[PDB]
Amino acid sequence: HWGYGKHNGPEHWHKDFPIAKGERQSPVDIDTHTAKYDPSLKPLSVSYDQATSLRILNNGHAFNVEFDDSQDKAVLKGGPLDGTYRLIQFHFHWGSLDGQGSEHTVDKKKYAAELHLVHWNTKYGDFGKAVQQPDGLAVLGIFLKVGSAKPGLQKVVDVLDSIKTKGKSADFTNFDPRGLLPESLDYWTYPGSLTTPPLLECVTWIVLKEPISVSSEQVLKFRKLNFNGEGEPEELMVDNWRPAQPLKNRQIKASFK
Ligand SMILES: NS(=O)(=O)c1ccccc1
Ligand SMILES: [Zn+2]
Structure with missing residues (x-):
């Protein structure tokens, strides 16, 4: 099965998932000088006040905090998006050392980690149908750098002991994902894919420019x-x-001048 080891990692995925070599794969390097301000982008709306978290799960690749998405509770709208996208889960990618861990890079800079808030387009009814569509998903990506502690992350950090191994889950109700955002919603956006198998090309990526700071102790517990x-x-x-993939025939747009 696919993973991140030398034997089953990103360089091997194409053998089971040929789309790994496709035309809109993620992540990518964001070359800040080539990205262009896009006046047509509408204001971005992150509306998480009624979010209903349910559970945290170690799936053997990362850990997911899962949300009740049976109603329009926590949603993402605006920006490059047409319509409403419902939050289903978030998870992170991280490194063995502070100098690596992010999937997207910014002028080739790797951050210590990257948070993905995953949303599906409500016009398609369910997540499964949404991943059969070119505009099925929107993932809000947020970089993590090591510095001061992120208070809103600590509840996540403290539950990790209970889900140490693949297949373990724990109750994780009443978690507020608003506590994981930076101050600014300035972002870059481009069309891409899931960054893990099945690598489906269904995602509008919205990557925030401002990283959040987390403490060394917090990221150490991820590890x-x-x-x-x-x-x-x-x-x-x-x-x-997964490392950065070829940009091919894509343009990255900036929300900010
Ligand atoms: N890593 S990602 O692109 O956010 C992702 C989201 C959902 C399923 C698989 C991967
Ligand atoms: Zn991810």
């Missing part, structure tokens, strides 16, 4: 998670990021 299941040889869950 104590395990890729393996309980009772199996320990393989630390680190470096669960």
